[PDB]
């Protein structure tokens, strides 16, 4: 070796208004030419103990490298720790100037931002997915060297380093922390498991928030508990149950064949369909009208409109807003989670696909099509950066049934018997809940507000519950509630709901 590599500043990660999420440090590296130690050897035990190793265990280190002109000692030092130590005047013993990530938000952002590893390369989250862009290119110096391997100096930058590029993510940090502390709290109120929260700007694709439980925080190395490093919003599949009746009625007010004051009979709350039974989460219903069929959550409802419509027509719309569908970001892990398709679709399959049953989807997934349908019906490309300039996005669904369909979902919070805890101070809101049987529960709600020019959605999950609720209005609406309160709030949404009069 005739050259030592120049490592290159990493690029700055930033929140969308500039706050830092992963910054470049100076730390310092030490390494150690045994051939010189060799002839050092009263040195040893002080260099050992500045090391802190144990003295024999390193003079046996060193005894066995003795061939050898470059051994490490210790990497990632601060500046003055590694001067310290090179203050010792051993022969033999050099430093390099290198860097290490400090992330200022620590475990908040943990599974967005991911990490790098004693190199200095990303491995994980957006550190591992923009790592060309945020790694530069290191250097090289030549050195001259004496036939026993002493460095005498640097001949020259052969080639410099170049740094790395800055890049401004999509998450707002000051929505990210509110929803970090209100899916935290409810993950504690109610005794579960895990669970995500992901906010979405609906105009311009941007994931604004996207938190989980467990986390960890990525500075500190050890322990290290791979199940608490899981970015479960990307890579956690689920049924989403209820959550997708609303695009089973967009399919519905689509196909020409029903109107919102349309009445469906779903007495005595179970329809059997050969061998097998639909059942409703209630049982106490006969007519209920189609807003009413989202109110109750009635399997039977959705279903009995789905044979009238089709499955083709269902699959159509869930497909178009993203369910079981790539969403194109670049992001390490991430799953697809399945829509499945039929060449002819069979009445049993038809009925589970309209109330989400025997699919499997993202949380990710879930908010972009919320988004979707907040947004008059267009869908925008996801995106995990700033957008500064929106792309033109796709017009999945009609802007008159998106229309209808956000006034369905803001009774189905706000009509008596609705989802009144998903309710948000200040302003109108629209959504729909979901628990989903894995008995074990997962607790749902995905939503948007205002629900007159609609702004921001947000999908909640909350994995096992453990208290005797566990119903996604009972256990994921408040979170919805409180997280919009501040994120509207926060965003400056002027409230459309003070009271009046
Ligand atoms: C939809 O997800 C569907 C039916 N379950 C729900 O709609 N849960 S909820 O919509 O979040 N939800 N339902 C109710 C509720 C319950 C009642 O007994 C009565 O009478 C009225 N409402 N609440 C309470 C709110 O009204 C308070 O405001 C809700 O929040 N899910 C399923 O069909 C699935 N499992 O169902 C359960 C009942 C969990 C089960 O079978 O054990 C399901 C769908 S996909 C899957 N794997 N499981």
Do not use: C
């Not at 219903?285 to 959705?302: A, Y």
């Not at 009609?398 to 989802?419: I, R």
């Amino acid at each position: 070796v005739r050259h030592i590599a120049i490592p290159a500043h990493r690029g700055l990660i930033t929140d969308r208004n500039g706050e830092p999420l992963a910054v470049s440090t100076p730390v310092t590296t030490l390494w150690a030419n045994p051939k010189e130690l060799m002839t050092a050897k009263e040195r040893w035990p002080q260099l050992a103990a500045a090391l802190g190793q144990d003295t024999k265990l390193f003079a046996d280190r060193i005894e066995q490298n003795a061939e050898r002109e470059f051994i490490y000692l210790v990497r990632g030092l601060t500046p003055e720790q590694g001067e310290g130590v090179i203050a010792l005047k051993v022969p033999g013993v050099y430093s390099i100037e290198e860097f290490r990530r400090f992330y200022p938000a620590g475990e908040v952002v943990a599974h967005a931002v991911g990490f790098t590893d004693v190199d200095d390369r990303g491995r994980e989250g957006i550190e591992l997915a923009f790592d060309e862009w945020l790694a530069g290119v290191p250097g090289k110096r030549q050195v001259l060297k004496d036939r026993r391997g002493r460095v005498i100096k640097d001949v020259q930058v052969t080639k410099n380093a170049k740094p790395g590029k800055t890049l401004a993510l999509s998450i707002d940090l000051r929505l990210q922390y509110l929803a970090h502390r209100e899916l935290r709290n409810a993950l504690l109120e109610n005794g579960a498991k895990a669970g995500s929260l992901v906010i979405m700007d609906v105009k311009t694709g941007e994931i604004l928030a996207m938190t989980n439980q467990p986390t960890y925080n990525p500075n500190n190395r050890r322990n290290l508990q791979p199940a608490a490093m899981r970015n479960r919003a990307m890579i956690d599949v689920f049924e989403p149950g209820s959550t997708v009746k609303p695009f089973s009625m967009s399919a519905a007010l689509a196909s020409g064949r029903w109107k919102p004051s349309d009445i469906v009979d779903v007495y005595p709350g179970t329809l059997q369909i050969g061998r097998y039974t639909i059942r409703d989460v209630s049982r106490n219903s006969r007519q209920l009208d189609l807003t009413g069929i989202l109110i109750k959550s009635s399997n039977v409802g959705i279903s009995k409109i789905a044979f009238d419509i089709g499955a083709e027509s269902i699959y159509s719309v869930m497909q178009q807003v993203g369910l079981g569908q790539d969403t194109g970001l670049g992001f390490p892990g991430e799953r697809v989670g399945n829509l499945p398709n039929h060449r002819k679709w069979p009445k049993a399959e038809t009925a589970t696909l309209a109330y989400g049953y025997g699919l499997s989807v993202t949380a990710i997934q879930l908010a972009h099509a919320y988004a979707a349908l907040a947004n008059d019906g267009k869908s925008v490309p996801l995106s995990m950066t700033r957008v500064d300039r929106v792309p033109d996005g796709v017009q999945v669904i009609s802007p008159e049934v998106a229309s209808t369909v956000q006034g369905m979902l803001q009774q189905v919070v706000e009509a008596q018997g609705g989802v009144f805890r998903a309710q948000v101070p200040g302003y109108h809101a629209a959504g729909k809940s979901g628990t989903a049987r894995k008995n074990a529960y997962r607790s749902l709600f995905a939503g948007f507000a205002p629900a007159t020019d609609p702004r921001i959605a947000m999908v909640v999950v909350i994995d096992e519950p453990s208290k005797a609720g566990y119903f996604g209005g009972l256990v994921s609406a408040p979170v919805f509630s409180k997280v919009m309160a501040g994120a509207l709030r926060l965003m400056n949404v002027p409230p459309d709901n003070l009271p009046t009069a």
